Design a protein around this motif. Structure first.
Motif, mmCIF file in Angstrom:
data_model
loop_
_atom_site.group_PDB
_atom_site.id
_atom_site.type_symbol
_atom_site.label_atom_id
_atom_site.label_comp_id
_atom_site.label_asym_id
_atom_site.label_seq_id
_atom_site.Cartn_x
_atom_site.Cartn_y
_atom_site.Cartn_z
ATOM 1 N N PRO A 13 0.821 -1.212 0.000
ATOM 2 C CA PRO A 13 0.000 0.000 0.000
ATOM 3 C C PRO A 13 0.852 1.258 0.000
ATOM 4 N N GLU A 14 0.315 2.303 -0.624
ATOM 5 C CA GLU A 14 1.027 3.569 -0.680
ATOM 6 C C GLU A 14 1.264 4.112 0.725
ATOM 7 N N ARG A 15 2.198 5.052 0.818
ATOM 8 C CA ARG A 15 2.538 5.646 2.101
ATOM 9 C C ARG A 15 1.445 6.614 2.538
ATOM 10 N N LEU A 16 1.149 6.617 3.839
ATOM 11 C CA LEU A 16 0.082 7.473 4.347
ATOM 12 C C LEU A 16 0.381 8.942 4.076
ATOM 13 N N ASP A 17 1.618 9.371 4.336
ATOM 14 C CA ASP A 17 1.984 10.756 4.069
ATOM 15 C C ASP A 17 1.888 11.094 2.588
ATOM 16 N N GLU A 18 1.926 10.090 1.711
ATOM 17 C CA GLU A 18 1.694 10.324 0.292
ATOM 18 C C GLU A 18 0.213 10.430 -0.042
ATOM 19 N N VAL A 19 -0.658 9.838 0.775
ATOM 20 C CA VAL A 19 -2.089 9.892 0.502
ATOM 21 C C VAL A 19 -2.681 11.210 0.982
ATOM 22 N N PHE A 20 -2.320 11.640 2.187
ATOM 23 C CA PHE A 20 -2.880 12.843 2.789
ATOM 24 C C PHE A 20 -2.215 14.124 2.301
ATOM 25 N N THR A 21 -1.397 14.064 1.251
ATOM 26 C CA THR A 21 -0.699 15.251 0.772
ATOM 27 C C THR A 21 -0.882 15.445 -0.728
#
Ligand SMILES: [K+]
Ligand SMILES: [K+]
Ligand SMILES: [Mg+2]
Ligand SMILES: [Mg+2]
Ligand SMILES: [Mg+2]
Ligand SMILES: [Mg+2]
Ligand SMILES: [Mg+2]
Length: 53
Positions: A13-21
């Motif tokens: 899964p993609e990185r969380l900081d990559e999703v919320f930014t």
RNA sequence: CGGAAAAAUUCGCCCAAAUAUAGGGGACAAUUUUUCUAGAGUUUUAUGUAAGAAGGUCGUACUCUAGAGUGGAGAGAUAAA
């Protein structure tokens, strides 16, 4: 081991900081690649015949 | 070498090698199938146009011949001869 590790990464899964930014791209443009036949293809073809005549 | 949206097959491509058995991933690549209309074409006598070819003409000038024409010694050439 080399196979499981490589297969796990390719399906991680993609990185969380990559999703919320990352900005939003409407799914209407990012996933609607299929081009179906015009549902009104028969009605339009019958009206085009009358106008052409 | 070269469109759009899907599908079959190769398992090309990638993991990925050791000229790798057997598998996985599906964007892309090869052959193939079905659809699509933006490329390429067809129809609707376009307009305009010294592309091409055939068979006939017109005219300005030039040229030859004739009228023992009129006229009667020059003319033309060249920077000058
Ligand atoms: K495969
Ligand atoms: K493949
Ligand atoms: Mg068709
Ligand atoms: Mg049509
Ligand atoms: Mg066209
Ligand atoms: Mg014409
Ligand atoms: Mg005389």
């Amino acid at each position: 081991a080399r196979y499981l590790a490589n297969k796990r990464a390719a399906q991680a899964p993609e990185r969380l900081d990559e999703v919320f930014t990352r900005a939003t791209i409407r799914e209407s443009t990012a996933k609607n690649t299929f081009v179906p036949l015009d549902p009104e293809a028969f009605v339009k073809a019958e009206e085009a015949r009358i106008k052409h005549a």
